[PDB]
Amino acid sequence: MREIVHLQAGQCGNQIGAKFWEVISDEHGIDPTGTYHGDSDLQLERINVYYNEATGGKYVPRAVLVDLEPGTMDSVRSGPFGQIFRPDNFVFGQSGAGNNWAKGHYTEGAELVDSVLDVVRKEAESCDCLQGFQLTHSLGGGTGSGMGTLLISKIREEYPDRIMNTFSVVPSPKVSDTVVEPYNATLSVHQLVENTDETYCIDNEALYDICFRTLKLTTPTYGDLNHLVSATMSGVTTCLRFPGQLNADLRKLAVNMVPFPRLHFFMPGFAPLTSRGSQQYRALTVPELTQQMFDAKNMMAACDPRHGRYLTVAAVFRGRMSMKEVDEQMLNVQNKNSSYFVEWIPNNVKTAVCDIPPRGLKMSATFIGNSTAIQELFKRISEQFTAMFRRKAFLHWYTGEGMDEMEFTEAESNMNDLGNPVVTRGAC
Amino acid sequence: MREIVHLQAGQCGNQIGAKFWEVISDEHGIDPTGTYHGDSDLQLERINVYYNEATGGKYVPRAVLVDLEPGTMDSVRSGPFGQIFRPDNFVFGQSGAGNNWAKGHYTEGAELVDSVLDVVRKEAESCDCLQGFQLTHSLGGGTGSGMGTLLISKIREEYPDRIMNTFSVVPSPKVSDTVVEPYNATLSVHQLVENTDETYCIDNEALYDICFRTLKLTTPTYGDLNHLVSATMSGVTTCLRFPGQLNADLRKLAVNMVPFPRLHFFMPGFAPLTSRGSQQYRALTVPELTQQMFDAKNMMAACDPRHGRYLTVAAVFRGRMSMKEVDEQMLNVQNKNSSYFVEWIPNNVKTAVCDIPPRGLKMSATFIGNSTAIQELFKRISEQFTAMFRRKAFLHWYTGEGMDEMEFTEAESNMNDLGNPVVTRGAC
């Protein structure tokens, strides 16, 4: 049996994971108390991929909740599906990151990380055949950047052959919530290069654009943004949660989407997305799903795919549907837009299909895209980093908590080091 | 499988097409909520000409609503068939035309026409075999004169081999509803000549004279006037939606009624019209149906057909009728009125019958006429236009919005040039 341990870092990762566990509990039939009140046995068929068993026949998620401040744990616990986790897994510290990557990596995070790895070790030993770990975190800011990279490094050292799926919220160009977002993202992408197996970059400005231009809401909240994250977070892993013709788990997606070991940064996508007033007027079919996936507005990263050639594409569909139409639509997309796909990878689109659709829908289609267009994001963080780092402002906390200027220089040089191969694959 | 994309511009086009969608939903069996509650399978057999299918079996009209001022959008929604329309197909802006062709063609109409064309392409590529676009607008006034002609131009450039129909409410000879409607009508006819394939010149006073001399109403409504328009709108496109002998669609009418490419301005007519007293003094048959067809009081344009010889006449009948009476009656009309049909086109009358009569009526018939007598409308527009453009009145707000003297010069020269074929064909 295949199973995944779910790790949440920081307030952003904690809220994203709380919405994720709400979505997964609703999909698998678990009530907020924890008791299974379902409709089909396929929900219990593969429930030991995210939920540990118990006595009493009601199930407990395999989620470790890491934070450096003891308030977001209380918020997550006070949430609707909050009293479902293991209270032992609520690991927290009486300190504050202060949006300091130095304080998330070289100090109090480094003294909480022992207990974090202890509960991770217990959850991984209480298993049959581990597939890997999925971490939800924000790339910019403290905690989930510093804790995120520290846990990924320690877990990759301990378990060398298990998958690492990190959903990272990249800081946006238009808006920002942390001054040292360029510093934290620059310091964190270096560990995300040689550690994580699939990193999914999710941009808040792109979530803004999807929630306003496509979904057409009036007052969307972080609950809705994290729900847009969680739909893709479930659609990636639905193939080993439910049966289906032409299934593809995390490694069967990773081999087909990672051509070179560092080019594993993706633009996720979800595309049965419709405004509430126009939901009834839709004619939901496979070509319409393909149009909405490949359209350059449902990307959850702020990277327009027309600015770079696609390296690899993954399309994981859900719902009873014809495979001929899927091959129709992928062949038609590759033929009509041939300059936006690389020519040294013939048929650079991977297709998976699952049978059970999400509740309230008929067909779903989650989207994963490794394209050249991530160079815009990586360079953008690099010029913001050099703008704040040429005059060396907001740096004395890092140097006082124990960093050195060559560490920041190595981080920016390594994001340039990551920007270069994405360019040389997009330009042959 | 031939399908039609409907388009409606301005207040006049919006209300005419709203009544048209009410009438055609009555004909096809669609309720206001969009579900199908019909009587015979012949309604559902060809329902895919005006209605895109959707999930749940509700049918959504294939119409695009264009108006610069979102007031008639609210009126159409608050009307009876307002819930049937797609909420995404309402394209509107934050401006007002002000009955200015300059403000409807060289201004914010240009920043709204891109969204209109995106909606049009979304409704045109969700198809298998497109036949044509039809546009309802007012010839005199803003928006519908400006955005109507601009949208026709853009769609004709994008789709050059499809039928383009325009139901245009032309200005009156007696009473004006817009002071600058000679300017608007001239600038709109200049585009309509070398863009469209069929133009239906409809006059409000002519529809009204049908409403009282033939129907004997006492207090009509513009809803009744657009009902008279919509009857012809449905009667033209009825052989492509219902079976019969000698079926004729839009192009089969076009090839027969357009002898030369510029002379495609027609006079619509629909005449099984019995009044509240003379319905029960009536002996409803094909000969008197042809009599009310060819009487010069059931014209929907204020242009007397006795003033100019007919170039081409077509009639689309509906109902189970013997064709000997139809053929003999059209031959008898052509023979007994020799001075009104030119002799170099023998049998210049197209006959096409369908088998399913309009609900309530046993035998009905539409009438479309290309005549020499369309010259009076263009001549009245030309003479009012030169009386206004002479003194350069009501023009500073066209040049301020950014037009030139040469555009008015070219439009007037083009329409006075068009006056020459439609006098030479009358004079052989």
Partner: peptide, 28 residues
């Protein structure tokens, strides 16, 4: 001419714009 993955791309003889060039094999 079609820009990208829009509706204008998948329509009969629709020529598509190429993606912009990138900094590889290019002077800095």
């Amino acid at each position: 001419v079609s820009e990208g993955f829009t509706v204008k791309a998948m329509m009969k003889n629709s020529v598509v714009r190429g993606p912009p060039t990138a900094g590889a094999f290019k002077e800095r």
